[PDB]
Amino acid sequence: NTDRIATAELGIAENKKDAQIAKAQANENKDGIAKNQADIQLHDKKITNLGILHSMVARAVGNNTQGVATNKADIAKNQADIANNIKNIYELAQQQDQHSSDIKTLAKVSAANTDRIAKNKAEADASFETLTKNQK
Amino acid sequence: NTDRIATAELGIAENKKDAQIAKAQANENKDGIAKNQADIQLHDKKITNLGILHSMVARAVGNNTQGVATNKADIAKNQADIANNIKNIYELAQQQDQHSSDIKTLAKVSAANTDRIAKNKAEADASFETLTKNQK
Amino acid sequence: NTDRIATAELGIAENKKDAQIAKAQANENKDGIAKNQADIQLHDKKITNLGILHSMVARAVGNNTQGVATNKADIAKNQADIANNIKNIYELAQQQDQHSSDIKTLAKVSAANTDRIAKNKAEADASFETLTKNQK
Numbered sequence: 123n124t125d126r127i128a129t130a131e132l133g134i135a136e137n138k139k140d141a142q143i144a145k146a147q148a149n150e151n152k153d154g155i156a157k158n159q160a161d162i163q164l165h166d167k168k169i170t171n172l173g174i175l176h177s178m179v180a181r182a183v184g185n186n187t188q189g190v191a192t193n194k195a196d197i198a199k200n201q202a203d204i205a206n207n208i209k210n211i212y213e214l215a216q217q218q219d220q221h222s223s224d225i226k227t228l229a230k231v232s233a234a235n236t237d238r239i240a241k242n243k244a245e246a247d248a249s250f251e252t253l254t255k256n257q258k
Numbered sequence: 259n260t261d262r263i264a265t266a267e268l269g270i271a272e273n274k275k276d277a278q279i280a281k282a283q284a285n286e287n288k289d290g291i292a293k294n295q296a297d298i299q300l301h302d303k304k305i306t307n308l309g310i311l312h313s314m315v316a317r318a319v320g321n322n323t324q325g326v327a328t329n330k331a332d333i334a335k336n337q338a339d340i341a342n343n344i345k346n347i348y349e350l351a352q353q354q355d356q357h358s359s360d361i362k363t364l365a366k367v368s369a370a371n372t373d374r375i376a377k378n379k380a381e382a383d384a385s386f387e388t389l390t391k392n393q394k
Numbered sequence: 395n396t397d398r399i400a401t402a403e404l405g406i407a408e409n410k411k412d413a414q415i416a417k418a419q420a421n422e423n424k425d426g427i428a429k430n431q432a433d434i435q436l437h438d439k440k441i442t443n444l445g446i447l448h449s450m451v452a453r454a455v456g457n458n459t460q461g462v463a464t465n466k467a468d469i470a471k472n473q474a475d476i477a478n479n480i481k482n483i484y485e486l487a488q489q490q491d492q493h494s495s496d497i498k499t500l501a502k503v504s505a506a507n508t509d510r511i512a513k514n515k516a517e518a519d520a521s522f523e524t525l526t527k528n529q530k
C-alpha cells in the first residue's frame with residue numbers, strides 16, 4: 123500500500139534527525155561534564171591546600187597567644203619589682219639626707235672642740251706664766 | 259507487502275518515542291551541567307578569596323611572631339637589669355647601715371670630748387684660784 | 395512497492411540503534427552530573443568550614459596584635475624607669491662615697507681632739523704640781 127509507505131518514509135526521516143539531535147546534545151553534554159569534573163579536581167587540590175595552610179597558621183597563632191600571655195606576666199613582675207626598687211631608692215635618699223645632716227652637726231661640734239681646746243690651753247699657759255713669774 | 263509495512267509502522271512509532279526519550283534526558287542533563295558550572299564558578303571565587311585572606315593573616319601572624327620574640331628579649335634585658343639594681347640597692351643599704359654606726363660612734367666621742375674639755379677647764383680654773391689666793 | 399519497503403526497513407534499523415546510542419550516552423551523562431553534584435556539595439561544606447576557621451583565626455590574631463603592641467609599650471615604660479633607677483643608684487653611690495670621706499675626716503679630728511685634751515691635762519697637772527710644791 124503506497125499511501126502507507128509514503129507516510130512511513132517521512133516518519134523515518136523525522137526519526138533520523140531526532141536521534142541525531144539527541145546524539146549531538148549528549149556529545150556536547152559529555153564534554154561539559156568532563157570540564158566540570160576537571161574544575162572540581164583543581165578545586166579539590168585548592169581546598170585541601172587551604173586546610174593545610176589553616177592548620178599551619180593555627181599552630182603559629184597558638185604559639186603567639188601563649189607568648190603574649192607569658193610576656194604579659196613577665197612584664198607585670200618586672201613592673202612590680204621596679205616599683206619596689208623605686209621605694210627602696212627613695213628610702214635610701216631619705217637616710218642619705220639624714221646622714222648629711224648628722225655629719226654636718228658633728229663637723230660643727232668637733233670644730234668647736236678643737237677651737238676650745240686651743241683657747242683653753244692658751245689661757246692656762248698665760249696663767250701659769252704669771253704665777254711662775256710671781257713665785258720667782 | 260502488507261505484513262512488512264505493518265511491522266515497519268510499529269518500528270517507527272517505537273523509534274519516535276526512543277529518540278524523544280533521549281532528547282528529553284539530554285535537555286535535563288544540559289540543565290544539570292549549567293547548574294553545576296554555576297556552582298563551580300561561585301566556588302572559584304570563594305576559594306580565591308580564602309587564598310587572599312590566608313595570605314593576609316599569614317603576614318599579620320609573621321609580624322606578631324617577630325613582636326613576641328622581640329618583646330621576650332627586651333623583657334629578659336629588663337629583668338637582668340632589675341636584678342642588678344636589686345644588688346646595688348642592697349649594697350647601698352649595707353653601706354648606709356655602716357655609716358649610721360660610724361656617725362653614732364663619732365657623736366659619742368665628740369660629746370665625751372666636749373664634756374672633758376669643760377670638766378678640765380673647771381678643774382684648772384679652781385686650781386689657779388687656790389694658788390692665786392695663796393700667792394697674795 | 396517492494397524496493398521502497400526494503401529501503402525503509404534498513405532505515406528503521408539504523409534509527410533504532412542511533413536512538414539507543416543517544417539514550418545510553420544520556421544515561422551515562424546523567425550519572426556523571428550526579429557525581430559532580432555530589433562533589434560540589436562536599437566542596438560547599440569544606441569552603442564554608444574554611445570561612446568559619448578563617449574568621450576564628452582572624453579574631454585570635456587581632457587579639458595577639460593588640461597584645462604585642464600593649465606589651466611593647468609596657469616594656470618601654472619599664473626600660474625608661476629602670477634607666478632612671480640606674481641614675482638614682484649612681485648618685486646615691488656618689489653621695490655614699492662622699493659621706494665615707496666626710497666621716498673619716500671627722501674621725502681623725504675627734505681622735506686628735508681626744509689626744510690633745512689628755513696631753514694638755516697632763517701638762518697642766520704637772521705644772522700645778524711644781525707650783526704647789528714651790529708654794530709649800
Ligand SMILES: [Cl-]
Nearest residue numbers: 134137273409
Ligand atoms: Cl524509524
Ligand SMILES: [Cl-]
Nearest residue numbers: 232235371507
Ligand atoms: Cl671632738
Ligand SMILES: [Cl-]
Nearest residue numbers: 193326329465
Ligand atoms: Cl608580646
Ligand SMILES: [Cl-]
Nearest residue numbers: 200333336472
Ligand atoms: Cl619588662
Ligand SMILES: [Cl-]
Nearest residue numbers: 207340343479
Ligand atoms: Cl629597677
Ligand SMILES: [Cl-]
Nearest residue numbers: 148151284420
Ligand atoms: Cl546527555
Ligand SMILES: [Cl-]
Nearest residue numbers: 158294427430
Ligand atoms: Cl556536570
Ligand SMILES: [Cl-]
Nearest residue numbers: 186322455458
Ligand atoms: Cl598571631
